[PDB]
Design a protein around this ligand. Sequence first.
Ligand SMILES: [Cl-]
Ligand SMILES: [Cl-]
Ligand SMILES: [Cl-]
Length: 129
Amino acid sequence: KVFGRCELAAAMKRHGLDNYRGYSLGNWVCAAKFESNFNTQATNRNTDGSTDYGILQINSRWWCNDGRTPGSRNLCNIPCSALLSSDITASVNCAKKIVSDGNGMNAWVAWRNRCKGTDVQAWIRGCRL
Ligand SMILES: [Cl-]
Ligand SMILES: [Cl-]
Ligand SMILES: [Cl-]
């Protein structure tokens, strides 16, 4: 599924991301836009052989099992294909564990390089929330 901007904002709010560990909703929408262009089916392979999955580009080296990343962990306890669902639940729940790990949203490279320190409230402007 390719979400609209406000549709995803609403979905993320309903799932408890607004101010989760102090990160306002617009941070999460901005991260999703630049990680996946709001497409739940997005995948990208990394140089190390791991792959990033779904709307928040969650990586198989640590967080999910794809059966092809040797030596990796599955800290979210989920197949990576669950992260590609039209239902963002699994992605959201795994993202909460990532953002709690110590480095906050700096785990998301696109967030660090394109969202951090910008006016992220712009991403939720006009939405009914
Ligand atoms: Cl915001
Ligand atoms: Cl893994
Ligand atoms: Cl933080």
